[model samples]
Target chain A: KPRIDMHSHFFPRISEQEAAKFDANHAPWLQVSAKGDTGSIMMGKNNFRPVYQALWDPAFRIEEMDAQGVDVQVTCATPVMFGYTWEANKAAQWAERMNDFALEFAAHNPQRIKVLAQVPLQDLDLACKEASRAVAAGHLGIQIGNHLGDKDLDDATLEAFLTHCANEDIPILVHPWDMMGGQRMKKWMLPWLVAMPAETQLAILSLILSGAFERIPKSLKICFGHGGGSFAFLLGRVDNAWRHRDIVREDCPRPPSEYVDRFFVDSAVFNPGALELLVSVMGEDRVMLGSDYPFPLGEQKIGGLVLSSNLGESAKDKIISGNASKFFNINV
Target chain B: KPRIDMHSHFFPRISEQEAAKFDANHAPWLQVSAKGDTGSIMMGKNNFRPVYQALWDPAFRIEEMDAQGVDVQVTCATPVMFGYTWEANKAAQWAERMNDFALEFAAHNPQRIKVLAQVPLQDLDLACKEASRAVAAGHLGIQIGNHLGDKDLDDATLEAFLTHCANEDIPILVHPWDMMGGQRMKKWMLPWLVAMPAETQLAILSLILSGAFERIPKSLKICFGHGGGSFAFLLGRVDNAWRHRDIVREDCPRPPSEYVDRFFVDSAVFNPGALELLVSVMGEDRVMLGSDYPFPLGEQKIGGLVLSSNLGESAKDKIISGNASKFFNINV
Candidate 1:
């Protein structure tokens, strides 16, 4: 199986010398969490942890990839770069720096590596400017958070950038930024395990209920990370709720379940059965290879789950490479 | 098939005249939203819409149940009763009133109606006291929210109640309170459709990861609503996280997936495949028949999803009756 991972992270580490220059105050600076082996990035509002070498060193990543038999990876900004709380234009600058870093790294060995753009999510205008720049910079596509503050996926503000992606054939990667429930349910990293999926699920539903997909041109290559959260499974629930309630029905023109085919989902769900269920629900063509690389929470064995599944050869082929090719319009 | 619907709701017609006696500050007094089409329960800070007659009227409930071929219902307090943001004593009083109301409804048709008591989740003593009272009042089990504001399932406060429920042979219903995302993800009630499960998933994970399941006796029967939210599907992700990260591994005694079988899940997942996934993840014996009866977001066709599914007869039979019989120790 010609495996191409669509979901993976790359964090460019900056030493104490370069950290002050990055303008995050210390967002890029990584420090040992004293007693704990995990390193933390001093990202202003809070310290984000688990900063490891595979983020900055392409060689280290390649070693991991080769060990797992992963032929290629489509890497994007780590979650820390998703600092939407920054003042205006700061996130754009961060995006620019991160995308530039990813492109420069991919330049070392183009065949083995692919890069996604880190577009500023707070403003679509800035995001579009950055997206086009990244595409021009030879980046494959753009990966963004599910929402920006109170503004969700259905917010009219995203239309311009979304349309731009459709017209340009630039696939959009929607990943959960932070836990929406955060401290409310924050115990033992449920923030990552639970709220993040809930966040993505909300974005997927918000867009569906808001008719974002129906209105957006079909050319847009939209892929949702973490196996589209619970979005794929809850399609029936939403459809059921959509049909019974006028509040939901009035908003969307079609039933919610029909839209599952419209976007791509990653294989980062981590279980063979879960992947099989996802493949069954979303169809094999819409499911693609994605592993939230460099994170314990992401799929480590790459296509191991998909391979171990009894979904058959063609389904496995589609998940690993065929769908990703279609998603990015990769002619290779 | 001797089916039992484990998840459902009921609220009494506490008129403004009677609401004062309930000391709810006229909170339970329901007025029609506009026309007589939907009743609005004036509860807490918000006015809840579409208060169904089935929430209180047993006759209307049985009629609807008969239409769906549901033989028995295990009804509990609606999610709003979980607005446990008040004084400890006030929440206890509210729990008392809810159990009394539920018991009264079950009294009208005792064989067909099984009651789950509401406990004051904010206070452990109050919750335990109410649990004892509810047991005396003939409630088959106890139902509580996933959290009490900042408190979570992992909170040490719940240990007393969890122990009490286990020893009493009383099952516990772990339901979502507000959407985990709440107001932040409140567009189109994505909270209910999507986040409700996410909340329950977090609660379930918290309970297990905190060693609540491992430390607690195996005799405790805990049923999670909405198919254990996204828990069943995300088991792979959690297990991987647990193995790869020391933090998670330190928290969980065994692999996270091992504890999945320790808890019971309902068949409230609206889709057949989703139910199938739930059964696969939790095992057929751990899946009890649960329908969020009288709610639009719930499975309207009741057991139709499971009955229509291609899953084996044993799984279907277990989901419809056998598992619930074991869960509640229902001699019937």
Candidate 2:
């Protein structure tokens, strides 16, 4: 069986002209500072060329998939854009550009790649339009950040976009980005190690307790990246709290476990033991392979890892490829 | 069968004289300044009094355990002592005092309470001595932090301690306190949210990769706190590194998973799904129930969580009490 990875990233190649336009704004951060430079712009200190090149190269991605034995890749932009606080018009334009770029990349490898369109969540109307346009362009689904700016997943502004996704029968893959209090973390460890999980956990908790799942029931299929950001491991605590506390009772009508069943998860836990545990908790049916591709920490060769795992053949088949194929309505 | 908890904590009531002593040397951070006095001491913010009160009160613990259906509790010391640099002589003295205090508490209710000796890793000789003393005093095991001062778990110093534990036939309860860079974390998340899991992952990785598990093999039974601190979840990644790299070839002759069967894990995961997953990865026979009593984020009523989980009955029986009974030789 072919394994489908629902969590991966692809950076579109932007022309130097286009890049120069954002130089005054976002491009400055991406520039490198070289030693002995006449100006303050040093080249080697903060060069993003290597990172951008790796992210944009399809061959690198395909090689990674080949090594990992992943047959399909679902590509999305980094979540940082979703939480960008630019004005609505600017955000919409950027979202459209990202979607167009992702679609073109997916078109290059139609058989092996599926695109999850990005939306400028800063503007609700524009975000909905982008989602519709991407779906019309043969995109598999939509990808979102855990939060939009400082607002939680169930904020009023997100309702319209979520409704659009649900109506279109598209899955929304939620990844973590800069979260509340994330800036305070140690330079390397905070964001990647701790904040990422916290961001996902907070969003899941909010969505469940705020009744977004109940209200929009099937509005959009949601898959949490990073093994559902600690939700699978914390469900018991949430359920216990729901049973004992009146606060959870106010918003959620049933036990928390019911809400957990409505969501899907990616197998990006990076641990065989954790993967087994996640399968045990969420069941093989709810999990699909994920390899935050192009990132050094993510799975470079998912296939060997999955096949070598102690999981039984049936569970392996479901997790590796069966679940994603069904979720994305892809024929293989 | 009674489930044994190899990981728990107890806080004894401190008299004014004892409090002053600790304030002077051990817990200088806890000392509060008079309103008019402004000094370098930023009053320790957390109101641990309630938590401390709960731990010292046996009736409260028994009531909580009864509600959870837990028959016995094996207690360790709070991770706070780990903050002190181990080089100080105070480290050894503090550990001795803490272990003695825990033994006395366990003796008060011999049938329901057991103790794990705390050691000051700063002084390996003293730590080994305390391990023997605690074991001889009827304690089930000894506990060590993932990192000793700035050193990792597999430091040469810890090897001697591990060897000693093996010789003495006493299990070592491995806990995480380094936070893996948690000092820089935001105030909102603090130790409970970020520090706990980061340190747990670091400790497990060090032990597994550094060949500690392979070296000690059977003599030193290592019980990981916090559902093995996400170790079970990340086992695949660790094994992946082993299979693909030549680094671990020196000590680990076989696949890393081979050593997994030899380790023990506690069910303080705080999530039923996570618990189920841990059982799936490690097998029901390897898990025992643990309640990090008095820690706010820990399961207060561990028995209730285990009893109500979706885990199979046989698995539940082993995890709740049976496996522990065999590991610690506890009778109920």
Candidate 3:
């Protein structure tokens, strides 16, 4: 049996010169160690965090994945590299460079690695073009931040881009990046622990509330990151609001729960209870293995949570590898 | 089978003199219709919303509760009456008045009605004093807004008050009110739909991350409204951050999930999947029947969600009435 880990992130090595080509505030520049294994990721003058070769080095990533028992890894761009606030044209170039880096990294172990390209969601035309280009160049799908700055996925600006993905059969992994309420939740890594999940929930709710799920072609296969980012857990509340408030149901035809089957999720939620709840809400086949590998906040054991869960073997099989195989069109 | 509706709200009728006595910005005043059945709850010069007889009339509330099949009703101060933003001493007067109104209302149908008094959380001494006074007067517990304006429950200002409740064996129902990010979530009642849950989650996480659970007595017996908000759903993420980051774990001994038993939740989540997940995380015994009755956003038929859920008779029994009886010390 194979385990396809679908939520690992990759950061491309970029020199100060290439980073200087974009806005200092939004662009991410890498500074590598003279020793060649360790480095730092910087945003302008601030150090976002220290990094290692595994972030960009395929061989290193594979060795770590092998140790974790992951057979195939779906590599996507690290959220810090999104640079969504950059100018559209510059952001487009940055997105292309990151996508190119990921494609090349996946090529180093094509059987063991797959790529989900990045796009400049700031520009709809460029985002769609690059998504189509990257997919045509053998990327499995696209990975996007849950929102473009202040606007969520349901915003009209992204309509064309989503429709294009549907037309081209591109599966999307909507990850939380530059989350909401960063200032308010500044303590205890709450941006990751709290706002990240809330951001994902907002994205899902926005789409459902704005009737994007109904307006778009059903072919637009999408998976929300971090077990749908608290969406499944707060689902009843969302539906309750829909049932009682015309504001929530005005644009949407049915309850938000009815849109549950329209998306997929990954088993990155850290406990058995939450995993069970995620599977109960999203369905077993809709949940794939997600580790968010190579990050301190991610599950290091890849599909270990699912494998050790009390769920039946059939459910475990789907979550660990079966779902990802179909989601990414991976033969393994 | 007695169904204890532990989450209904009551708004005390206030005359113009009382309204003028407090700060216009923070105090709520009411304007009753000529028919004396409907009125508007006002904040200063602004009309917050329209209210009906059920909000303040005992006879009206009982009629509605009878229609909804609720045997015993535990009425708490409406969130707006929390007046957490009001000046402390003046707020104390308002809280006392509200408590007096509730204690008297419960007398109208002593067997069928109970009270959870309101307090002025801005002043810890005053809050504790009012809580004790209300409890001694036969109120089952005190109800509070989850946060005091910008500060969450974990703030130092709240520590003494929570400790006092513990020492007094006072139970609490933490509700979401004047929620965070009001300006940001102005559209489509996002304040209620999104920020409300996030606010509850922040309160739970704050208490955990600040190590309040360890410092406070286990007898505090605080239950969060709206099914513990979104705290149960996002527990895994909070635990993951605690495990991976020293910042999150600095004040805490264990993961957030470890503290799930330290608190209770209500069955106001509105759907079976969410209720099942809530029970799974918080345990069946820790869940009580709650319906924000007499409000459009609430379950009009109290305990309806739990009664109709697929959970076993035992689990359903606990959530519907058994747990509330134990939590509130109701003989029924």
Candidate 4:
């Protein structure tokens, strides 16, 4: 089986003048070096992260993928560029632009690259419209923030969006951004290490407790990043609450664990024991290779943990590539 | 083996007049009927939780513990009563009063109950003095908030308190309260289910990244509640950051996982798969039973998950009872 990296990111090179047309606070701009090969992304005036050719250059990404022994990379726009806070029209336009870049990037090596699209999740109607347009324009799936500003996945509008994805048979990738406790945690990178995972957990619980999981169609395949945001490990706690409290299970009849297998998760949990636990709780088939590649927090060597883990070869085969191929419907 | 529940709570009924003597905004009081069999805790005017006879009544607690098959209960004041936000002297008085109540309650059934003391952590000197007094007055260990207001476990003042714990040979129980993202998570009981765990994770990371674990004497035996706050499952991610980023490991020379066994963690994670993962990562000896008893969020049957798990009796024995016996230096 060929190794497919189900989680990787791309930074579209939207020019300075083009970015100027959008909301300064919401739109991210790239500050390129004189060589144009290296740059940094800025959120208004705050420097987010320095980037290199591999992030925006399709050829460089394929080269890195080859070096890492990855045969296919299922990529999406970097979450910082999600533009979820932008006005509806601007967000729609930005999503269209991002999707065009992704489709064009994938066309560079169709067999080696598969891409997901961003949506204007700030407005559900606009989000669905862009989602439809992106899928029709050769994007394989849609990528969305775990929550839109203060609106969690259980928000009524999000239900319609999930329903749209279900009807369209479009896969969804949920990534955490604008973490909840960012202000309180200025040191130790607590936002990434702590808040992000908690945010994802909130997203999953919101869906489960709000009955979104039961109310939404099964065909709506959703995958969460960062080992599904500490959800697999806490399933027991969630289930216990569901069993004990009416508020927890009022919307959903079954305990939370019953819904565990319905969604997919990435193997970005970073350790053998964690991977074992993830596989044990989430099931081997539900996990796929994910490297938040080109980012410092991501696994540097794609599929390295799965390859080195003591899990049976059969399980390894499924996790490293087999599952991603089926989940994303990519030929490898 | 005795079924020891290392985590349970007590709500000390200080009279309304006594509560009124302290900071009204921070001090919590009980609203009870004239008969007083049941009551509700109110923070200022906000109702925190309803209380029954079991929370503050020792005989009633023993009856419930006996019915639940818990042989021993390690009780401490509820987290809301930590008084970390109060004036230092008032917090000291509050801690002393709470500790006195715990000691008297434990006296009700010396073998069936052991108690931990609260400290005035807002003032390091006062906290140490109270801690010494409580330990001298038959308290087996100290129970503290995971973080004090804006100050995390890594703060310089906390180091002095931890050093004192080491010198006093005090076992510390870290409980999460006033969680980091609490304000943002107003729905779905997110404060308890999501933010609390994240707070514990932050506390652990703060200690690890700040080299507090390395700096403090190892004699200070610390155990974290809520399955050590998603720390075991996310050990890989934390260790990965330690390896990849200079900021993550600048103070702590070794990877975060290398320090995993240095402390104890309660098995309050609430599921079999999670229990298995806790054992796999933290070792059987480092894991102990913690039920967060006498609260709706707690396990109804103390030590229930350990008993029902697929783990061998040997592993189960250590988690369900043996570990707590050794960690707390209590005979079983």
Best TM-score among the predictions, by candidate number: 4
What C-alpha RMSD separates each model from the true structure? 3.0, 7.7, 2.3, 2.1
lDDT scores in order:
0.79, 0.68, 0.84, 0.86
User: Global CA lDDT of candidate 3, please?
Assistant: 0.84
Off by over 4 Å in 3: B24-26, B34-37, B182-184, B310-317
**Candidate 4 residue-wise lDDT, A88-201, digit = tens:** 898898889989988888999999999999999988889999999999889899999998777889899998998899989999999999888745677767788888889898
lDDT of the structure predicted as candidate 2: 0.68
Q: Over the stretch B1-332, how does candidate 1's per-residue lDDT look in tens digits? A: 78889999877666666666545452465665454446767753357565766776788788888888888889988776653776788778878887888889999889888999988878788888889889778999898888776677887788667887888787898888765554565556677787777778888888878888877778888888878888888777788778877778776879888887678888887777787788888888898888788886677777888889988898888899888887886765
Write the candidate numbers in order of decreasing lDDT. Answer: 4, 3, 1, 2
Measured by DockQ, the strongest candidate is 4
Off by more than 4 A, model 1: A13-18, A22-26, A30-47, B21-26, B31-39, B44-47
How do the residues B217-290 of candidate 2 rate in per-residue lDDT, one tens digit apiece? 47567777877765565555556556644554455676766766777888877676676677787888888888
lDDT of 4 by residue, B1-332 (tens): 98889999888877566787886666887777578788888877678788788888899898898899889889998988988878899889889989998999899998999999999999999999999999899988999998877788899898789889998899899898887763557665677789888888888888888888888998889998888878888878888888788777788888888888678889988877778888888888898899888888788878878889888889888888898898887898
Pairs clashing in candidate 3? none
| Reference-based TM-score, model 1 | 0.93
Query: Candidate 4, residue B299: CA error in Å?
Result: 2.1
In model 2 chain A, the worst 10-residue window by lDDT is A35-44
DockQ (model 4, Cα): 0.72
Query: Candidate 4 chain B — worst ten consecutive residues by lDDT sum?
Result: B181-190
TM-score order of candidates, top first:
4, 3, 1, 2
- iRMSD computed for candidate 3: 1.8
Q: After TM-score superposition, what is the CA distance of residue B153 in candidate 4 from its true location, in Å?
A: 0.8
